């Protein structure tokens, strides 16, 4: 925007060359990083698929070898980036844009080859049938980082917009809705004891069901006092509602 | 300079520098004024130098000076110190890559590395199969920043072949100083290996077009692009030539204007001692497959060398053009015996002798024209085997129909003539209905 505003200024004629050079470099860094962010995300949620699954090697051997080679190339490029982490240095890397394009193409080719694996993982957690292939890949691959899984709980549950987690992000303490209403699990579910996504998700849903049952029992016990009562005071009713 | 870089705390001193320079000057004169001549001429030049120089020289009464290199410390050290008796791996026997170290081999490798380091065009001259390509590739293995591209010249070779090679492996880029031709990859020097530089035909006015083209690119550093008449300058492009002696049939002497830019090294056939060393090493590596046969390595190598020598002497290019024998046939001999011995868990001496005779027949008798030559080859194979392998079953090893095939078995084993005939008849019956 600043470059364009300088362009429309009358004093731009003396500064045409270097302003155009800066426009070119900004356009090139944008073009590089737009594909870079996507490539990074795809590698992030494909490495989890290809490492956390022990039987994917036997189910999809050729694709496993292809992804191992692609990941090796990506780690080599990442090490080259970390050697000189300057934005201009990585920009000036010989064929960095072309490498990013071929990486995106290869990751897309691998991603489309993980269909049957997803359609089979849906059998473990039944609610995965209502989740798209890209979303399912993001869920399964990024099971370790549960911070970014909060946006996928609305597609699997009626009102569980997000889950409640401890500081370590290793034990599920409860669930939350879109309005901020929270349900605290009576027995919190630990992800460490059940590392796989589907088992601890099933434990979370079962704990939600039993927790709502127990809280319904407690609420019924509390509200039977309000029944068969000639007069009810406001404050206790309001605090019971809250 | 490299020694000084290796020793930052103790740079080269003046006395060590002068000693090194004097010894290297004598060594360079010897290898520059006689590198394109036989061993006897090199010895004569060394004797003349010893008679006329004042530089300190090796004290050995009979060893010629050319056998001594110049160590960086400034003293004469024999080339024999860099030729260890290696033990080749069994799976790398007679492989194209493996090179058995030899005095001539190490001397020529050092000479080529000296010439190739300056990007100076050079020519290797010698009889076919002497080891010119082997030595060049071995020297180029010591220069990781060089890519070699092989071109094979013929009687019809024209600069168009070089232009196609340049189009494939190089790119024409426009620069402010003009058009520059450089290899597509960066930081590497392209080496053009022309295997038959002296075959291209001379016109009726005694000029080879491709030789003049190469001379123009070497002396003037470039050529003219005939599409737009634009001068093109070469960058990071090097030339290496190989050729048979000009006295050989079909070979033409190179122009004196071309020869001034290219030093010439003469790579002659290895002597009987060098051949014995190389192929005894190969046989020792080969014969470790069968432990019971390890004691027969030396007689086997001696028989191979003797038969090769007599075949080379008896059949020459005077009789037939294809009567060319070289260490290449010895390498093929070793490779054939090795491939015949790989699947065999055990084998008596007679079986080894039969394989040796079969490979000798397949290498030295297939190309023969007249029947008398083939009879000579048969009789002399028998005599050589008897001489170098006494006290063996003559009839069991040299039943005249020496046939080997893997058609009747999973492995390469001797096959009877009648069984082979029946099998070929059945296979022909299938062949008629199929092909």
């Amino acid at each position: 925007n600043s470059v364009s505003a300088m362009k429309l200024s009358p004093y731009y004629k003396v500064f045409e060359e270097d302003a155009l050079s800066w426009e070119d470099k900004l356009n090139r860094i944008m073009a590089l990083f737009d594909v870079w962010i996507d490539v990074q995300r795809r590698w992030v949620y494909l490495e989890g698929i290809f490492t956390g699954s022990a039987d994917i090697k036997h189910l999809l051997p050729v694709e496993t070898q292809r992804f191992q080679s692609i990941s090796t190339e990506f780690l080599a490029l990442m090490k080259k980036v970390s050697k000189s982490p300057l934005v201009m240095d990585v920009l000036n890397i010989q064929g960095v844009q072309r490498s990013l394009e071929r990486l995106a193409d290869l990751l897309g080719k691998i991603q489309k080859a993980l269909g049957e694996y997803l359609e089979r993982e849906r059998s473990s957690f039944p609610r995965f049938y209502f989740v798209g292939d890209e979303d399912l890949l993001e869920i399964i691959g990024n099971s370790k980082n549960v911070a970014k899984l909060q946006k996928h709980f609305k597609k699997m549950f009626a009102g569980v917009s997000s889950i409640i987690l401890n500081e370590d992000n290793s034990v599920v303490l409860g669930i939350s809705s879109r309005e901020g209403e929270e349900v605290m699990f009576k027995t919190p579910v630990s992800i460490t004891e059940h590392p796989k996504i589907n088992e601890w998700l099933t434990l979370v849903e079962k704990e939600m069901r039993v927790t709502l049952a127990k809280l319904l029992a407690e609420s019924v016990t509390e509200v039977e006092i309000f029944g068969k009562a000639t007069s009810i005071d406001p404050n206790t009713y309001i605090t019971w509602i809250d | 300079a490299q020694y000084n870089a290796n020793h930052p705390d103790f740079p080269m001193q003046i006395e060590q520098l002068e000693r090194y320079i004097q010894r290297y000057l004598v060594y360079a004169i010897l290898w520059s004024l006689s590198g394109d001549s036989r061993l006897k001429m090199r010895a004569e030049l060394g004797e003349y130098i010893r008679r006329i120089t004042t530089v300190p020289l090796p004290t050995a009464p009979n060893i010629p000076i050319i056998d001594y290199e110049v160590s960086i410390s400034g003293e004469w050290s024999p080339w024999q110190a860099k030729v260890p008796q290696i033990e080749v791996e069994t799976h790398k026997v007679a492989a194209p890559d493996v090179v058995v170290p030899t005095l001539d081999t190490v001397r020529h490798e050092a000479l080529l590395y000296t010439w190739l380091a300056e990007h100076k065009p050079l020519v290797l001259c010698g009889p076919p199969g002497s080891g010119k390509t082997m030595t060049l590739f071995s020297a180029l293995r010591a220069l990781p920043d060089m890519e070699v591209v092989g071109l094979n010249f013929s009687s019809a070779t024209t600069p168009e072949l070089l232009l196609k090679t340049f189009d494939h492996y190089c790119e024409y880029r426009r620069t402010p100083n003009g058009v520059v031709l450089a290899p597509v990859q960066l930081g590497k020097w392209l080496v053009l290996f022309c295997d038959e530089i002296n075959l291209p035909d001379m016109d009726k006015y005694g000029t080879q077009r491709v030789i003049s083209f190469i001379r123009q690119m070497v002396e003037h550093g470039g050529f003219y692009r005939t599409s737009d008449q634009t001068w093109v300058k070469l960058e990071r492009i090097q030339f290496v030539g190989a050729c048979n002696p000009p006295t050989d049939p079909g070979r033409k002497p190179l122009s004196h204007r071309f020869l001034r830019h290219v030093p010439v090294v003469y790579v002659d056939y290895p002597g009987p001692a060098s051949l014995t060393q190389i192929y005894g090493t190969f046989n020792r590596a080969m014969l470790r497959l069968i432990p019971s046969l390890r004691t027969y390595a030396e007689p086997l190598t001696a028989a191979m060398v003797e038969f090769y020598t007599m075949s080379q002497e008896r059949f020459t290019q005077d009789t037939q053009p294809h009567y060319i024998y070289s260490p290449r046939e010895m390498t093929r001999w070793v490779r054939g015996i090795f491939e015949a011995l790989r699947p065999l868990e055990t084998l008596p001496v007679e079986g080894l002798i039969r394989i040796w005779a079969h490979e000798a027949l397949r290498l030295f008798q297939d190309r023969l024209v007249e029947d008398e030559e083939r009879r000579w080859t048969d009789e002399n194979i028998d005599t050589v085997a008897l001489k170098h392998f006494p006290n063996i079953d003559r009839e069991k090893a040299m039943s005249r129909p020496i046939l080997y095939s893997n058609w009747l078995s999973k492995d390469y084993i001797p096959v009877d003539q009648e069984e082979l005939r029946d099998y070929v008849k059945a296979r022909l019956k299938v062949f008629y209905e199929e092909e």
Partner: protein, 322 residues
Amino acid sequence: RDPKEWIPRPPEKYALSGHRSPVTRVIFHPVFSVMVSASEDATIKVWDYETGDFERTLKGHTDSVQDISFDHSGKLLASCSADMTIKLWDFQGFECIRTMHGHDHNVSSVAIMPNGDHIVSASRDKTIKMWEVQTGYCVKTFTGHREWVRMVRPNQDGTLIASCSNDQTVRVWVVATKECKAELREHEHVVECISWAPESSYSSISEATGSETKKSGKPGPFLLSGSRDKTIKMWDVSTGMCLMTLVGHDNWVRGVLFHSGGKFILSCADDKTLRVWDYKNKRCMKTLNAHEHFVTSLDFHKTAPYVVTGSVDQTVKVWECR
């Protein structure tokens, strides 16, 4: 005689010789105790394998018969010959009830689908065709092979058909959707014969190859492919990987199959020998000097302990197993 362990023994039972031309293939009748052999004299002779007595000849083909097969009930016999025709035989009345044309050249294989309502055949015009039994109409044409298709064999449930060709590859097709499921290309020469793995050997194959048990419970169909490079290779159709390579024949492999008990591999080659392979240890147990010339085919009876091998010497032999 362990009910799933017998292997053939070098004392032959009978050496039936009535053919005037090399015997192409030999099969067993699934229900009756009867044996059928096809030869290059355009005749399909029928033998009794208990008493070694010739019964009758099924003629009608013009040129050499290349393959014969039975349906599950054994009530129909399908034979293909070099005259580009496939004939369906009513084995009860021993008459040709239907002759099917449509292949453009020599037909080298034929097989009846396990459902029995379709016939699959492979020929030299690089195509595999499917024919209705009832109408004789061609309904499918599996194209994709680049050379002469030598064999075609359906799996146990009939959903997959495998084929081998002169193009040195083995292809597995899907009958329902005509697509090529996999293209198994590791043989260095022309592939002659193929055979599917029975369900009784799935556990044995999985434990011999070291393959970990799949969470689905099905190890996946396994395929064998004898070829002219004197090797036998076991494949995993689901993954397309060669589980093992069996080496030891001295010539081109002509036939290969499993023991009905799923513990051994029986194979015949042109090295004049019949070999029994222990794929558990990937080694050959027993070698039988079956015939005096090339051995063209073999069959293993499902229940009775009997092995039959045809040969180019115009002799069909029955082997007792002990």
